[PDB]
Amino acid sequence: LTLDTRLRQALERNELVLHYQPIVELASGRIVGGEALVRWEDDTGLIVALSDWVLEACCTQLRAWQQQGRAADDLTLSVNISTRQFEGEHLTRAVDRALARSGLRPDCLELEITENVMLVMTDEVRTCLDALRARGVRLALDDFGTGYSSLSYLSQLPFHGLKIDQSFVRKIPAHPSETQIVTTILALARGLGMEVVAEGIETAQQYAFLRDRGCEFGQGNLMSTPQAADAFASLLDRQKAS
């Protein structure tokens, strides 16, 4: 409760900032995405309020980079959405508000929803996901492999992408179990027309394993830790010049 207290005060006082972790096209090395991650610089209502802020902040940041000629047309940014945000009407409203104020092209925004959303899959959740899809926003399943999936729902739901959990990526290719989980996820995604981001790439062996198996995308401290907006935009600049 003391932790929620601190976050509330941080929100009230505007003491939060987004950092962004580059998401790279493994074959080219091109930064094509970035996961927005909340940092503090020193209750469902709190989740909702934080997400409203994150959504607007992230969409505004990308729109700003586009207008300054720093973000290429292929750059998208991703925001993490809690399963707890599907209660009521608020998520679709928050996304609509962020897009309206920023003027951002909706397919520039991607929402990362943890796998265990499938465990709370009600009619209201399915309807929310369809509503979000109808707006042109990209949807990804996050932490994939660590939660629970219905193979029927996975085959039906409008997710364009999956993110392989870091806990598996960090153990390949040495460990058979984690390695077969990763290669299975890649095969699933291929048949479902989903793109895959491998989260938590730490070593060059991991990068190379993943690339040589058609894993589209990667993110990890190997390439870049989460970066402040200005540091992230520097990477975009160097890439544009290259």
Binding-site residues: 21, 35, 38-39, 80, 112, 142-143, 165, 199, 202, 221
Cα 185 versus chain centre, distance:
17
- Quote the CA–CA distance of 232 and 117 in Å, as a whole number: 30
Out of 151, 174, 204, 241, which residue is the one contacting a second copy (CB under 8 A)?
A: 151
- Quote the CA–CA distance of 113 and 217 in Å, as a whole number: 17
Count of CA atoms in the C-beta half-sphere (13 A) of 95: 28
**Binding-site entries for 3',3'-c-di-GMP:** 21, 38-39, 80, 202, 221
Chain position carrying tokens 């940014």: 77
Chain position carrying tokens 């402040």: 228
Q: What is the torsional sign of CA 29, 80, 179, 200? A: positive
Nearer to Mg ion, 56 or 165 (CB): 165
Site membership for a second copy, residue 145 (CB under 8 A):
yes
The site string for Cl ion over 80-119 (x = CB under 5 A, - otherwise) reads x---------------------------------------
Please choose which of a second copy, Mg ion, Cl ion, none residue 82 contacts, taking the beta carbon within 5 to 8 angstroms, the exact cut-off set by kind.
none
In degrees, to the nearest 5, what angle opens at C-alpha 176 toward C-alphas 172 and 177?
Answer: 95
Please choose which of Mg ion, Cl ion, a second copy, none residue 21 contacts, taking the beta carbon within 5 to 8 angstroms, the exact cut-off set by kind.
none
What distance, in Å, lies between the first and last C-alpha atoms of the chain?
49
Whether cis (ω within 30° of 0) applies to the bond prior to 22 is no
**Binding-site entries for Mg(2+):** 35, 80, 112, 142-143, 165, 199
Site membership for Cl ion, residue 60 (CB under 5 A):
no
Please choose which of Cl ion, Mg ion, a second copy, none residue 38 contacts, taking the beta carbon within 5 to 8 angstroms, the exact cut-off set by kind.
Cl ion
Residues that bind a second copy (CB under 8 A): 118-119, 144-152, 154-156, 168, 177-178, 180-181, 183-185, 187-188, 190-193
Binding residues vs Mg ion (CB under 5 A)? 80, 112, 142-143, 165
